[PDB]
Design a protein around this ligand. Structure first.
Ligand code: COH
Ligand SMILES: O=N[O-]
Length: 152
């Protein structure tokens, strides 16, 4: 788990996200899609996006980025006590959306990249350690639900 001090860092970093949730969400998804084009293919409603310019210009992508980061932020504020929030996300992503756990690894990495890119010099070594732990916990708890479903 995370220490209280680590959770405090996580939620302090998250305050940065909340100042522009759509902008952060958009950049995370663009980072995912551009670094790993296979992920774009899981989104019927974004596979029409052929270029990063089109991605950047997509208001619906920004909207989805808001949905995604709002869900994650709710989960993080539970500080690990997230079974009720996390279980349904794990199940929709395995059974409906067919998202292998690797892609959750990719988006976790994208979140770390975007934080540095949008806040250069303001996402310190302690903060990165804490956020990384929180994202691994999230990923690891999803992985447990995936195993339950025999998904992947
Ligand atoms: C690589 C693809 C992949 C990844 C890594 C991913 C990772 C994450 C992630 C990790 C931080 C969070 C918090 C969410 C959160 C959400 N995702 Co996704 N999602 C993904 C593919 C999808 C797809 C596909 C949909 C449906 C989009 C649509 O058509 O509306 C989706 C829908 C959602 C929804 C809408 C409700 C639902 O369908 O369950 C939420 C909330 N999610 N997602
Ligand atoms: O982009 N995650 O749904």
């Amino acid at each position: 788990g995370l220490s209280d001090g680590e959770w405090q860092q996580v939620l302090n970093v998250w305050g940065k996200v909340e100042a522009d949730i759509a902008g952060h969400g958009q950049e995370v998804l663009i980072r995912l899609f551009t670094g790993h084009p296979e992920t774009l293919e899981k989104f019927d409603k974004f596979k029409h996006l052929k270029t990063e310019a089109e991605m950047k210009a997509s208001e619906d992508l920004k909207k989805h980025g808001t949905v995604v980061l709002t869900a994650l932020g709710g989960i993080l504020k539970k500080k690990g006590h997230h079974e009720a929030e996390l279980k349904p996300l794990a199940q929709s992503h395995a059974t409906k959306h067919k998202i292998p756990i690797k892609y959750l690894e990719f988006i976790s990495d994208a979140i770390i990249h975007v934080l540095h890119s949008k806040h250069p010099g303001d996402f310190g070594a302690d903060a990165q350690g804490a956020m990384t732990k929180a994202l691994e916990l999230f990923r690891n708890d999803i992985a447990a639900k995936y195993k339950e479903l025999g998904f992947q």
